[PDB]
């Protein structure tokens, strides 16, 4: 049929893929090649004028990476996809394709840090100005728009305390004033949230996280309309960042994404159990998780997301020293700064990533001294709860 | 000892590599990982302040890719290396790290086309102006410099007719006026030409070509001083292009580069034989190759390069139709647009890549109707000559 | 702690694995090496006398493949593991290590065909005789034992009609007469059945099927006591079959097995729904599935297996021509002879694999003209049922 | 044309390979798949009766590994090839396919040790007897043949002292009495020696050594007539050893073998220089190398081999303690037991591999206390000579 017609789990498995026409191989072959041969001089010009269907060099396009791009276009309900070297490269290829000297961007403040440096330092050095706002208050977005504004940029849920942004409302706003809305959907995956279906124009992900899911690939993807994707490919990728994905990396992420549905169901079932345990514990002051009915935006969460996610933040009694003790006493959870792997990962920003930042500066950035972030994996939830209970008790 | 002390062939083999300290594995392991675990909260902050020796996430750095970077630093005689997703990404990470709105660049006109689009369209859209000149005349370089000029950019040899640029003379010029010189050494590899030893500040390569050598990796490398490489890594890569190399790609290129010396000796021995054959053939009007004593810059070539290279251009009698016939009649050489593989590759720009460009426009770009470009491989030179003789005879 | 202490899902994730001691890499590195270097002459003899802990050459042992072997030892509750090139190599390395000229084997008749050729042709040519029996009747096993009998060999469930063998009862029998029991657990995986816990001495699997799960690796594993595994390694592998697993293949199977629990739960949930649909359909004469209470050995199944599996056989009304029509009319299920992949696979032995065998010969081998075998995947069960209903209706 | 018509270097590059018909990809794709899909029930039976051209499962055959097999068939001038998991598996698949209970084998004594255990212990346990002789004296081969003799087995050159066997003379002998001759050509590669052209029936190699050449693959190949290769595939591989090669391993060895000609020329040029240096050194008692005119079989070497190889053995003054000191004092050569890598490898059997064997037993096995074996790599020969001179001087 057409893969766009089956159920969502059937699409995760089949979309963008078929048996190799030449041999019947069921697995997508790894086309680990730099160049592609023509059968005549005429076929050579046909392709080079983009008139012919074909490949020319991998930096431009490849059969392996084309399969991954078509799969993720189906899952997010967009026209076309484009793969990239990193999550960062997906966001920069995007915004450097759209913007030029004299343009303006409105951005959420609560976004990924490497993204925050690109927007606050690199963009202004090329003539592109950025205003940062609290995107949980849609009126702040409206008040910062200018006649020069080309793009509005948001993430949801947002780190470190998992606050939300009302995608449908923000899209309407940006579009009223002739801007595009760009959403980073890395935290949720297309299994749990679909920003294009709520009005967004372009969606980006680090596949490094849940879409791959196995902790062994650095990569990104951009999904949107065909006429935007063509410019992102033939200008942004080709003539600006040079951030292409390797064919082996595309094959590993096609392999990881086959299990996306069954991994997201288990991540989210395990995280709800662990968040209820932490909510009842007398040494934990706060628990930030969208699935708990005390979250300040619980009802928006219930309309916009099909599940509440695999990430939890929480605050331990006793501040900086207590969080340092808790982290040093886990024996099953692993200390690391990534997320979305099959193993449970834990980190304590105040004593780890943000140790050089000044207390009152982190504080205005949402990061208290006792805040711990947990990426819940696929282990038995009992075992994770037991490791947490033991480390909390010691710490406190 | 110190790898910087052995002969050049010994360095190609050993530099940047050692047996795995943990197991004795002779091959560099493939660290195909997205993240790295800390043993305590304290080790986590140590590394994050860059105080500690270690890895954090692969986008930033990885043990596999660190080996490739250290090897190529040794071979070019530079302080440090930085690997990247493509040849394009090496050049863009470089120039976007150095330049900002209001700066100026002086560039050769005879450069790789994707590089020509980045410089003529993308840079001016960010506030960075570029002047193009004929770099074989060092006076044109001098006359275009301005008080705003940060960088001079050259390739040598240059495509499509293999003209040269006097690296030592151009370095002196740029430095007199306080600019940096950036050289693309893709065509020669560090086995045949060493731009840092002649005065250049930074060297870039597509490893896609000879450094890998096997037609199965898209990649780049930048070599320079440690204080420039640190900024290219922690700002250009991390916060601008996001163009990191995958660890599998770094491992394949470490494997390919082991044979660089013996491949470059054979490429260059085969190309001199084939260029002498073509020079004596009555249906060939011109032969462009640095090893023929009739090349207009033969003596500069003899001082700056240790061998004359594996690439040849040549013009066939009868213009456009004759070149189309010749290309369609080879049976051993393959039609393709890359170079530096183990197989011999042939292309005819006028009927292939540049068919949509207007005759008189290509002409001013050095490309006549009869020009063919040949990348000589590792086959028996007799067999390649026989395939050429047969196709020329038919065509003409 | 000790991985042998956590819950089963925690073990699937963590057992046999840890962060790389040298770098902190979370993913097991790929040690794609043929040899290992010594630091002195003395360390060289230490290892060669097996006194020292270390590696020597990969055919013998490797850090990547050692991780997979230790994981699967934990999951089956055995002392040690040994990886191999194929499912076949696991069974042959096993039985050629145990047996010699003049020995005897008692085997089930209902086993995998390539195994049936090794036992009926290759073994007798080396002096080793084999008696085949119906292993669902434990008295037939007892009546075939001889004073020379070293090994009893069984599979359960068994193909093509999914009959069972009572592992606990057969172990007791073999042991009473001083033989070992060897069980092929390929169909169930250690998530659903644990033969060593019921009395078996040695368990073998093709990892090609569910343990890998992704249709991209050919491989096997043998699990047992350390003193048997040492002989299988240093004699059977080293001096008889030479069937070692590559380190890349071990890394892909470690990656696939991370999801084993969540894949087996979904395979088995989807297969029960599809088997109930087929049981109610008027054009299907029989349905063979252990989860249906009409299976002749339902209660044994309920004691020995934790779930009923992802495989179903069934007979369509109208014999040979009807089965050929049904197979040619599916549009989502794929025609192929493997099983345990993420995609649903279908086959019709009478018109496909066994077309050259004589009707009455196949018949005595359990294979009727209308028998179809289905390997249920991870797609939406509604979509699979709809594709079956459509193809059955046409066929019939 | 037909690849069988070009020169030898052209064949190393091109034979068995072509651009992918479906996409034009120049590199052979990696078909990393376990199964292959049929388009109808009829195509399924066609292939299963071996009537149709196609693949079924990788254990049996694969497009990647088929390319490697066809290349090596061309290079050795045989009809067909068959790839395998290890060098050992190539030899065992071979001899277990040919022989059965009651048969006899005549073998050289001076062969690889793992091969010596298979022949002296495993074969007699299956009813197959073996007589060992000194194959440098063709009369000993003749005197051991019996009416039961099916196969004669030789290696040349032979380890540890590089003595030779006259292939043409031994073939004539075996054939006079109706046996097959099987030659292990691992030490030479098909670039330097071609046993099928001198009368041998079957040739085997470990590709682990020179054919791969890069120290990162364990593998083997068997080359012979099509009717022998078919039985080795459909019976020996399928029903006896199960020793198939993975498709990634076949792709790495296709990539390594592209440089075989240029690597063997440099290995052999470097080894002749190093063997002349050692021949003139007053602390070295003997030098075994086929290229020195004092080798006892120099003239046979000059007729049978096109170059003299990359391996050297030599004896240091002072016996066991002197060899232990020399090995512990090299700083560029690496201590290891493999050979044929791009790095120079050294070993001292008496203090390393054979430390547990009794002095007088090793002695009868050709191994004196002072014997060192050197595998010469691709480094600068000056650097290797300097490292040897320094270590010899200290030792002595």
CB B122 within 8 A of CB A126: no
CA distance D297 to chain C (A): 32
CB B88 within 8 A of CB B113: no
Q: Which residues contact B199 (CB under 8 A, 6 or more apart)?
A: B167, B168, B171, B172, B175, B181
Q: Where is the domain boundary, C233, C260, C287?
A: C260
CA distance C41 to D326: 10
Looking at the fold, whether A192 and A272 belong to one and the same domain comes out as: no
CA distance A235 to A229: 10
Q: Say how many CA atoms lie within 13 Å of D380 toward its Cβ.
A: 13
CA distance C289 to C282: 18
Determine, yes or no, domain membership for C322. Answer: yes
CA distance C88 to D235: 12
Q: Which residues contact B214 (CB under 8 A, 6 or more apart)?
A: B252, B256, B341, B342, D27, D255, D258
Q: Which of C65, C90, C21 is nearest to C248 (CA)?
A: C65
CA distance B116 to B103: 18
Length of chain B: 396
Determine, yes or no, domain membership for C226. Answer: yes
Q: SS3 sequence, chain C?
A: CCHHHCCHHHHHHHCCCCCCCCCCECCCCECCCCEECCCCHHHHHHHHCCCCCCCCECCCCCHHHHHHHHHHHHHHCCCEEEEECCHHHHHHHHHHHHCCCCCEEEEECCCCHHHHHHHHHHHHHCCCEEEEECCCCHHHHHHHCCCCEEEEEEECCECCCCECCCHHHHHHHHHHCCCEEEEECCCCHHHHCCHHHHCCCEEEEECCCCCCCCCCCCCEEEEECHHHHHHHHHHHHHHHHCCCCCHHHHHHHHHHHCCHHHHHHHHHHHHHHHHHHHHCCCCEEEEECCCCCCCCCHHHHHHHCCCCCCEEEEEECCHHHHHHHHHHHCCCCEECCCCCCCCCEEECCCCCCCCCCCHHHHHHCCCCCCEEEEECCCCCHHHHHHHHHHHHHHHC
* Cis previous bond, C157, omega within 30: yes
Looking at the fold, whether D224 and D346 belong to one and the same domain comes out as: no
Looking at the fold, whether D236 and D364 belong to one and the same domain comes out as: no
What is the structure's resolution, reported in angstroms to one decimal? 2.0
Determine, yes or no, domain membership for D1. Answer: no
Burial class of D2 by CB neighbour count within 10 A (0 to 12, 13 to 18, 19+)? exposed
**Helix D41-48 crosses helix C319-329 at what angle (to 10 degrees)?**
110
Length of chain D: 396
Q: Which residues contact B158 (CB under 8 A, 6 or more apart)?
A: B108, B110, B111, B135, B164, B165
CA distance B27 to D217: 10
CA distance D253 to D347: 25
Best residue of A329, A378, A386, A390 to probe chain C, by most C CBs closer than 10 Å: A378
Tell how many helices (H) and how many strands (E) occur in chain D: 16, 12
* Cis previous bond, D160, omega within 30: yes
CA distance C339 to A24: 16
CA distance A25 to C334: 12
CA distance B144 to D239: 76
Helix H segments across D145-185?
A: 167-176
Residue A146 domain boundaries: 6-260
CA distance B59 to B80: 17
Burial C340-358 (b: 16+ CB within 10 A, else e): bbbbbbbbbbbbbbbbeee
**Helix B319-329 crosses helix B381-395 at what angle (to 10 degrees)?**
130
Best residue of A243, A252, A338, A358 to probe chain B, by most B CBs closer than 10 Å: A243
Looking at the fold, whether A193 and A278 belong to one and the same domain comes out as: no
Q: Where is the domain boundary, D210, D228, D260?
A: D260
C54 contacts on B by Cβ (under 8 Å)? 23-24
CB B280 within 8 A of CB B294: no
3-state secondary structure of D362: helix
CA torsion D358-D359-D364-D366 (nearest 10°) is 120
Using the beta-carbon criterion (under 8 Å), do D118 and C33 form an inter-chain contact?
Answer: no
**Residue B75 parent element (H or E):** helix B63-76
- Considering only CB atoms, which residues of chain A are within 8 Å of chain C? 1, 6-10, 12-14, 19, 26-27, 214-216, 255, 258-259, 261-263, 265-266, 331-332, 334, 336, 341-343, 377-380, 382-383
CATH of the domain at C55: 3.40.640.10
Looking at the fold, whether C144 and C57 belong to one and the same domain comes out as: yes
Q: For residue C288, is it left (φ>0), alpha (ψ between -120 and 50) or beta?
A: beta
C-alpha angle A236/A237/A239, rounded to 5°? 70
CA distance A37 to A89: 29
Q: Which residues contact A284 (CB under 8 A, 6 or more apart)?
A: A278, A314, A315, A316, A317, A392
According to DSSP, residue A287 is labeled E
Q: Where is the domain boundary, C230, C260, C290?
A: C260
CB B23 within 8 A of CB C247: no
Determine, yes or no, domain membership for A1. Answer: no
CA distance B245 to B58: 9
3-state secondary structure of B170: helix
Q: Which of D62, D161, D52, D149 is nearest to D109 (CA)?
A: D161
3-state secondary structure of D168: helix
B38 contacts on C by Cβ (under 8 Å)? 24
Determine, yes or no, domain membership for C1. Answer: no
Q: Which of B274, B272, B270 is nearest to B388 (CA)?
A: B274
Sheet with B220-224, strands from edge to edge, namely B80-84, B220-224, B202-206, B180-184, B149-155, B104-108, B129-133
Looking at the DSSP bridge assignments, the partners of residue B182 are: B153, B202
Q: How far is CA B261 from CA A93, A251, B11, D320, D359, in A?
A: 37, 33, 10, 38, 44
**Around Cβ A274, how many Cβ atoms within 10 Å?**
22
Q: Which of C355, C79, C343, C367 is nearest to C230 (CA)?
A: C79
**Residue B277 parent element (H or E):** helix B260-279
Q: Which residues contact B342 (CB under 8 A, 6 or more apart)?
A: B213, B214, B215, B263, B377, B378, D13, D258, D259
CA distance C382 to A6: 10
Using the beta-carbon criterion (under 8 Å), do A36 and D24 form an inter-chain contact?
Answer: yes
Q: Which of D301, D299, D369, D377 is nearest to D336 (CA)?
A: D377
Looking at the fold, whether B207 and B222 belong to one and the same domain comes out as: yes
Determine, yes or no, domain membership for D314. Answer: yes
Using the beta-carbon criterion (under 8 Å), do D26 and B341 form an inter-chain contact?
Answer: yes
3-state secondary structure of B282: coil
Residue A184 bears catalytic tag = yes
Cα B143 → chain centroid: 27
Q: By what technique were these coordinates determined? A: X-ray
CA distance D254 to D246: 13
**Around Cβ C328, how many Cβ atoms within 10 Å?**
17
How many CB pairs below 8 A link A and B? 234
CA distance B305 to B273: 18
CB B47 within 8 A of CB B38: yes
Q: Which residues contact A379 (CB under 8 A, 6 or more apart)?
A: A270, A332, A343, A344, C6, C7, C9, C10, C13, C14
Residue D2 bears catalytic tag = no
3-state secondary structure of B183: strand
CA distance C300 to chain D (A): 32
CB D316 within 8 A of CB D392: yes
Looking at the fold, whether C128 and C82 belong to one and the same domain comes out as: yes
φ, ψ of residue A373 in degrees (nearest 5) = -115, 135
Looking at the fold, whether C43 and C163 belong to one and the same domain comes out as: yes
Determine, yes or no, domain membership for B155. Answer: yes
CATH of the domain at C384: 3.90.1150.10
Looking at the fold, whether A230 and A91 belong to one and the same domain comes out as: yes
Burial class of D283 by CB neighbour count within 10 A (0 to 12, 13 to 18, 19+)? middle
Looking at the fold, whether C268 and C243 belong to one and the same domain comes out as: no
3-state secondary structure of A202: strand
3-state secondary structure of B88: helix
CA distance D267 to chain B (A): 11
Using the beta-carbon criterion (under 8 Å), do D36 and C336 form an inter-chain contact?
Answer: yes
Looking at the fold, whether D59 and D162 belong to one and the same domain comes out as: yes
CB C1 within 8 A of CB A383: no
CA distance A350 to B119: 43
Total of domains in chain D: 2
Residues of B tagged active-site:
59, 112, 184, 209
**Residue A191 parent element (H or E):** helix A189-192
Please tell me chain B's helix, strand, coil percentages from 3-state DSSP, rounded to the nearest 5.
40, 15, 40
Determine, yes or no, domain membership for A151. Answer: yes
CA distance C96 to C151: 11
Looking at the fold, whether A54 and A197 belong to one and the same domain comes out as: yes
Using the beta-carbon criterion (under 8 Å), do B7 and D332 form an inter-chain contact?
Answer: no
Residue D71 bears catalytic tag = no
φ, ψ of residue A214 in degrees (nearest 5) = -115, 10
């Amino acid at each position: 049929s057409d893969c766009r017609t089956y159920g969502f789990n059937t699409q995760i498995v089949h979309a963008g893929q078929q048996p190799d026409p030449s041999t019947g191989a069921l697995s997508t072959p790894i086309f680990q090649t730099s160049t592609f041969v023509f059968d005549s001089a005429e076929q050579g010009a046909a392709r080079f004028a983009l008139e012919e269907s074909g490949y020319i060099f991998t930096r431009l396009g490849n059969p392996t990476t084309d399969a991954l791009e078509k799969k993720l276009a189906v899952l997010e309900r967009g026209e076309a996809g484009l793969a990239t070297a990193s999550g960062i490269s997906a966001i920069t290829t995007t915004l450097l394709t759209l913007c030029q000297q004299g343009d303006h961007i409105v951005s959420a403040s609560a976004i990924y840090g490497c993204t925050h440096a690109f927007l606050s330092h690199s963009m202004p050095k090329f003539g592109i100005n950025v205003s940062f706002v609290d995107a949980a208050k849609p009126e702040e977005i409206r008040a910062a728009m200018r006649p020069e504004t080309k793009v509005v940029y948001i993430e949801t849920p947002a780190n470190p305390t998992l606050s939300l942004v009302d995608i449908e409302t923000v899209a309407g706003i940006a579009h009223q004033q002739g801007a595009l809305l760009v959403v980073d959907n890395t935290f949720m995956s297309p299994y749990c949230q679909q920003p294009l279906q709520l009005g967004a124009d372009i969606v980006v992900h680090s596949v490094t996280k849940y879409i791959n899911g196995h902790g062994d690939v650095i990569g990104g993807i951009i999904v949107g309309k065909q006429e935007f994707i063509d410019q992102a490919r033939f200008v942004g990728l080709k003539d600006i960042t040079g951030g292409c994905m390797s064919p082996f990396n595309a094959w590993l992420t096609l392999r990881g994404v086959k299990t996306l549905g069954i991994r997201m169901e288990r991540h989210c079932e395990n995280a709800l159990k662990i968040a209820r345990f932490l909510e009842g514990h007398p040494s934990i002051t706060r628990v930030y998780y969208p699935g708990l009915s005390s979250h300040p935006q619980y009802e928006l969460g219930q309309r916009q997301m099909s599940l509440p996610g695999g990430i939890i933040s929480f605050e331990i009694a006793g501040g900086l020293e207590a969080g340092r003790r808790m982290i040093n006493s886990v024996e099953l959870c692993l200390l690391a700064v990534s997320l979305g792997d099959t193993e449970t990962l834990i980190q304590h920003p105040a004593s780890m990533t943000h140790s050089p930042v000044a207390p009152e500066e982190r504080l205005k950035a949402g990061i208290t001294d006792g805040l711990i972030r947990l990426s819940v994996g696929l282990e038995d939830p009992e075992d994770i709860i037991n490791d947490l209970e033991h480390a909390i008790r010691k710490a406190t």
